[PDB]
Amino acid sequence: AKKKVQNITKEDVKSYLFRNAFVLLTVTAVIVGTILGFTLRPYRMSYREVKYFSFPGELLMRMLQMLVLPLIISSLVTGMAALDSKASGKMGMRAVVYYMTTTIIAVVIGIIIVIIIHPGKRVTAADAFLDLIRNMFPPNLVEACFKQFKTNYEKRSFITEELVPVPGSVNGVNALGLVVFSMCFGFVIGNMKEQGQALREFFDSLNEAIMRLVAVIMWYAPVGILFLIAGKIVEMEDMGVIGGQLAMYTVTVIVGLLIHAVIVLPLLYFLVTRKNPWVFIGGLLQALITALGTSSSSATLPITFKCLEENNGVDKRVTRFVLPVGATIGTALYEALAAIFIAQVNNFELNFGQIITISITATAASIGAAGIPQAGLVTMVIVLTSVGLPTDDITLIIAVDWFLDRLRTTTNVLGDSLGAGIVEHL
Template identity: 65%
Template sequence: MAALDSKASGKMGMRALIYYMTTTFIAVFTGIIVVLIIHPGKGSKAEFGKQQKIEQVSPADAFLDLIRNMFPPNLVQACTQQFKTKYGKRVVTVTMTVNETLFNSTNATQEVMEISREEAIPVPGQVNGVNALGLVVFSVCFGLIIGNMKEQGQILRDFFDALNEAIMRLVAIIMWYAPIGILFLIAGKIVEMDDLTQMGGQLGMYTITVIIGLLIHGVLILPTLYFVITRQNPFTFIAGILQALVTALGTSSR
């Protein structure tokens, strides 16, 4: 962002936002359709789902959490935690006065009743996880400021270019040794399984579902969108960014 002109980066950012929202919506819709067709969780134990507690979340609070996470008060904390509204319980006591009249007489009695009920109240909280949205918003704003500084920001641009190159080399090293660690992680989980046949079948169906969804989205939908927008061969473009795609696949990056 620092290397781009502010007007060009603004147009590019708006187009990127529209593209991201569109492809995300299509990906969610595709995933739901594939899951409904394949049913990867079919055959699992019925009591497994009953043990999970579903937390009720207000749509308004979820949207406000999204806004709050866009502007983290602490960047270091944003690397490990993100804001999330939690719900506490509060007991509310209501006092009611009941008038009673006996046999249409003038004598009446009053009875005071107290009714207590519990209500959920939103409480600010934190959950473990990288606040990627806040970091991205800060990085974009910071990059735009550096870009407007012209020559004064050249030192920072050179620093972040060198930092990016160092991180890419580190990621390349991790990608070479990651399969060894993944092998031992999977082996440890396999040893802990009680019913290897049932778990293997469920994981197999889950893997097939994920692969089919990725193929539909990556081979059909995205190239079609590229062709509709640019009127160019999408596979020529994919061949040019093949190395970046392999890196994203190896690091589980979007």
């Protein structure tokens, strides 16, 4: 093995460097930012100076929270429009219901994990659920863009001392109502065979425009993350506790992802398929390695097709339509983990009623996240804008997201292949 790399060590790496430039550049940026923040700590310097130095970080944050809304709305509209055309039968509905219930299982197991292990170091619950149910329908799109709905207590109703609710408003970004409206509108427009042809192409072109808008603006990410890390490290005190907290987050996410991959998914596969998933893993290991390496679901998609066609012994007839609609419709688990950790870090009360609300917000946020490989930053922007919490804690959760992205894409390919197998069985 070591002899082959000693024979291939010739000076031809420029093509490989250019093909995988983004990951190396962002890793180097993170490393240099951490080094600069550590070495700039002794030099005491003012708050105005730290804002001046760290401006590009929040500038990148501002650009991403520009991109948050049109990206998700247009991508989900396009996906919903394409779902009806490709999945014209009952098996497509079966597949989407299967994927919905699997992601519900993922989010509930994740919330149970975060409740029981505590990674961080009716009075409101009923009100929180009530406000979520109301939040599915904000006043309209314009209000949903910049403020949510939140119940208050005006204390003057009706010898009268009670926790009387009263309507109120809270600023932020209301994705949940927006995302559900987008889902319904996409379903309606996809129900069109010919009447919606003109409308579908315009939204698709807008979707591709937003795709390349995200793509071109992401080349600024290295220096922005560099400066964000450098600015945030020097102003944050007691590095030991934050390091312990980020280590606990890393352990929590890695353990949860592996257990969801290798217990609940094999169990549900064996429940219905009644076959051995180990042979499936042996057949698909090549595709899994390719997904781990490239860290791109779309790039390894033909590899997955060929692997399931030749090695896994899967009938090819079902494969053209279940996989693409499923890909467009484990990300929710990671969103919920990040959101609950962010809520826990800033000493919030963390009631048992808001946990379900943040779980639903996270699972709705990740439906139309992006088609880019490195979608961690945009997803974190989505969830932090939808929940309203401050978005300054990006650095800690993105300092390790490069490996979490490989884990995300490998879990995605496992889930997609097993869904293809289960719909082949049905």
